[PDB]
Design a protein around this ligand. Sequence first.
Ligand SMILES: Nc1ncnc2c1ncn2[C@@H]1O[C@H](COP(=O)(O)OP(=O)(O)O)[C@@H](O)[C@H]1O
Ligand SMILES: Nc1ncnc2c1ncn2[C@@H]1O[C@H](COP(=O)(O)OP(=O)(O)O)[C@@H](O)[C@H]1O
Ligand SMILES: Nc1ncnc2c1ncn2[C@@H]1O[C@H](COP(=O)(O)OP(=O)(O)O)[C@@H](O)[C@H]1O
Ligand SMILES: [Mg+2]
Ligand SMILES: [Mg+2]
Ligand SMILES: [Mg+2]
Lengths: 371, 371, 371
Amino acid sequence: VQALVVDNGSGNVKAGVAGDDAPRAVFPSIVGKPKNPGIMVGMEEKDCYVGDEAQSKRGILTLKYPIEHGIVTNWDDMEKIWHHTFYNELRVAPEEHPVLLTEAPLNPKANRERMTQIMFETFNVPAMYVAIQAVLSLYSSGRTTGIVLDSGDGVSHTVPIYEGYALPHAIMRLDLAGRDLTEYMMKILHERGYGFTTSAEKEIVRDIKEKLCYIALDFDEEMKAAEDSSDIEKSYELPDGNIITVGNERFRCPEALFQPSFLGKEAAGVHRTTFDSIMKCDVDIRKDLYGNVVLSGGTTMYEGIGERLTKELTSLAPSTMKIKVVAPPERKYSVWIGGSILSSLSTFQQMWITKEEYDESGPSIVHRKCF
Amino acid sequence: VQALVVDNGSGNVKAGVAGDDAPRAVFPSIVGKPKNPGIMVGMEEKDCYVGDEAQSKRGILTLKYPIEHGIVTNWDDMEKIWHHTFYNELRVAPEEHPVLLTEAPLNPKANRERMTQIMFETFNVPAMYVAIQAVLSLYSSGRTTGIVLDSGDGVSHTVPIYEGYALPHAIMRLDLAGRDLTEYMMKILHERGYGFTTSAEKEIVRDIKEKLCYIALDFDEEMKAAEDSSDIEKSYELPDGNIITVGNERFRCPEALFQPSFLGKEAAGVHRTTFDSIMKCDVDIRKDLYGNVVLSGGTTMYEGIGERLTKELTSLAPSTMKIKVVAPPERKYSVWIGGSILSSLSTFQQMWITKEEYDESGPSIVHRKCF
Amino acid sequence: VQALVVDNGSGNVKAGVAGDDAPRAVFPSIVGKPKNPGIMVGMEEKDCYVGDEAQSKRGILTLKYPIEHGIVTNWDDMEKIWHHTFYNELRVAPEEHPVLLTEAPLNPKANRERMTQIMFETFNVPAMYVAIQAVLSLYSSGRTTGIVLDSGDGVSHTVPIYEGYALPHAIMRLDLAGRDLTEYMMKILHERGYGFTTSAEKEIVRDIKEKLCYIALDFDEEMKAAEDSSDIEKSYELPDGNIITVGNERFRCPEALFQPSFLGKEAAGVHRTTFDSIMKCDVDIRKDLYGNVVLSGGTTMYEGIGERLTKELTSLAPSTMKIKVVAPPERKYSVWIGGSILSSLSTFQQMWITKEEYDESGPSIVHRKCF
Ligand SMILES: Nc1ncnc2c1ncn2[C@@H]1O[C@H](COP(=O)(O)OP(=O)(O)O)[C@@H](O)[C@H]1O
Ligand SMILES: Nc1ncnc2c1ncn2[C@@H]1O[C@H](COP(=O)(O)OP(=O)(O)O)[C@@H](O)[C@H]1O
Ligand SMILES: Nc1ncnc2c1ncn2[C@@H]1O[C@H](COP(=O)(O)OP(=O)(O)O)[C@@H](O)[C@H]1O
Ligand SMILES: [Mg+2]
Ligand SMILES: [Mg+2]
Ligand SMILES: [Mg+2]
């Protein structure tokens, strides 16, 4: 019996069966409801739409995300999304497979407890487990030492591991991820006269950001060069045929990853977060940590991110250390692949939280078994 | 059948087979335990690490020494270290070889008794013996007259021998050795803003002390010269790439050997200890004792120690006596070489404490056979 | 002419005139700078804010501490803080009064040298002196024998004194104080879903810690009792009207004083630090040291700290010794009161470092005069 691996990100759901090379169901984690609840007679009317179907007819829907910053904010919508995942995407019976779930570090306890309670009492799974996403990413890379910088839609976090041992006091969390970048792109697109306010327009802006943005090697020099020419400008076509043009916004939008003050946030960038995490470890671990900086998540898919991170870390670290940044081509799915690997191990089969232990101990069992 | 020679120092273990020119296993006498007992699934988790392996991954371990000042303080860890020595380093069966052990003079009796009991009942050796380290050092030098000043990691002691005869009433013991010097270097490195507190940082400080320290010929003049220039300063590179610089600390750290008041200790230096040991012998032995002062141990490996000791002894002794200090290049292994020589002698083969005598008399047999 | 007494702690500044019963100026040791450097036309714009004024409008400022762990890390900000202290708080001319300063033991020498240079060349004082804080605390108590455990915001240290004589080799330093506790409270408040990241939020968290925390007599029993009831929970109101609730965090946050492994630190607690300091003295001093354990600083103001310290020391000490822990009600100002007493003594008036000796010898004079 193979386990099911579900990665509940803030933006997307990655689900599949353990042992597969890639997830087989990747759909947006959205729920949409019709603005005008009324349909032509004879047509089937649905109260809400989930996933790709919600994304397809977003023009007449209001879209909601049940997860913000890695924390579930609407449990009914989360339950609907999980039901969709199990019954329409994977097309399996969850009562026959154990389920491996994922969560971000330094989350509130009630989130984990509700996850366990809903898995055991609503879907009637035989067993389950909750794992940290960066640890799974390190599993995917086939390494036992390194620091993982994970950035998706909700949060950014860094977890260092040395020779298989965890360093919990060095875990750092930054509340700046892809959704913040999409909002900032929306805000700065008003300078050119383009106005996006609705949910579907938010999705269009996210599309534009994914297709047109990149990270500059030197920000001031690139701004100066953009002010002196026009070859940086690119065009994008809207669903209705209109065309928008973007200049320095292309590298200005992702610059908020390294300069969080662009969003009005008093916080350090991802480079400084990684450096601070490394400096909170023992002196004898830092060389290897510098040698194995690993990127993971969708927000690390910008062009030129590795070069910029290497430059910043070289500036911050001593001149003798060698900084190496690894950017796998499939790093958008590293968490799922690592979860599949972990759930496929013979030694892991004793770590499941079974239904008997749950019936004995309540939802609090997850705290003393997953850590 | 050759015997095994094991020198259980406070800092290091020297082990080998009798008849060899040098010991074949020299590793630190440490046991390390993981701070966070948890490893990635699929990895082999060990409760504790011994020796070079413990030294290699000290960044995630807490290191302990089972011996302080020549006295075993943790018998389980000592047993683990001996098991490592026999089975992973030497790769022999201790039940087939007699074992020669070493101890410092004026130690408590229970230490020797426990050594004998553990050797006979846990490792099932055929025979064993316990010898004094300075006597073995005198064996190594091919001489029958002289006074040996031995200084390693735990204790310093002086043993005079004349024409092969022992002088037990003249043996002196000083509780100041390399570990005290490492602690004092740690304390005085805080003046420059460098902070070392953990066990791995203790090992790094010991490394620095070994590589950068020396003994000044005249302390006050050298301090004055250091206050007037900067050519004494040297640099050291930490495992993480940072660089520290040391000035007069280089000769201030080992000066506590000759001025124990630097450590807050009411005791005489090694020169005064040696002189007092010589003055406790008969008037007819002192000339030869002055003529054959022999150094042994790792703490006697500082640069310029022989010149300083000669100057101090010349100051203390009458002007007609000739003071000669011998500093063999391999004096860090003189105890092991002397033990090998002693255990390889045809006349020594009747001095072994056999298993029959042990079964007859209990662990108290060691007191009436080794002396 | 009365002297000025300034206690430059890591968290707060206590300043006043010698002979007074209490300090007359107690303000936070912070410097704040506006995030958005722009103000309405006609308003007075200040580059930076110091002290209570910085604390009052922290919502638009970024706050910095110029001292960490008793070591000045930003000398321009320290100079600004001293200028504020002299000219806006005390409202005196520093060129007319001698100044008594304080420092933590085992600090780097450059800190003291810079203090002397800035006092003599920037503020043009006639004389000055630097004293150890625990010694001043012992002055305040009217006793000549005892061991002082001082804990403020930067560091914790223990200094034993017997019959007026100092024991420098027994001074111990622990790098765990109130700021570490505030950071740990911030970290563990994420379990309930409360997120504090900014500097002003750090100040709010420190407020919460001061108002709601206490030390448990037995940690395991108290944790068990907290897991079984809800009467331990208390509520706190934020500046914006929102309400947070805390359960076992109240006694979990200060427990890191006795269990430094909660912070990932390989170090002994304050009880073990005090015991180790006592055990490094002569056998004939320990009875009195056990009899006169004295608390000082703001981190010793938790409820139940004396009982817990007494229990731990009773566990560690022989059963015949009497352990007495003194907790003065005004122990948050013992260093300042002791400094005032010391600077008001007729015999102390020859210990000042005058401007003539400084002009003769440079900033190095402080090393051969204050010790
Ligand atoms: N090629 C790309 N370039 C830039 N950003 C991308 C790219 N692909 C995806 N993203 C961004 O990554 C974010 C979410 O990715 P993902 O790691 O799946 O998030 P989560 O794991 O939280 O669901 C989205 O906001 C999206 O805009
Ligand atoms: N070249 C050197 N210079 C100075 N000190 C040294 C040197 N080599 C070793 N030491 C010191 O010698 C001490 C232990 O040496 P050793 O004689 O092996 O001790 P033990 O016999 O007690 O194990 C260590 O504390 C180490 O710092
Ligand atoms: N009543 C209290 N209970 C607990 N902690 C307190 C209390 N009052 C002050 N503190 C803590 O004491 C710390 C600093 O006190 P103080 O001794 O003035 O430090 P410093 O001398 O380093 O300026 C602060 O971090 C504060 O949180
Ligand atoms: Mg993700
Ligand atoms: Mg030795
Ligand atoms: Mg203080």
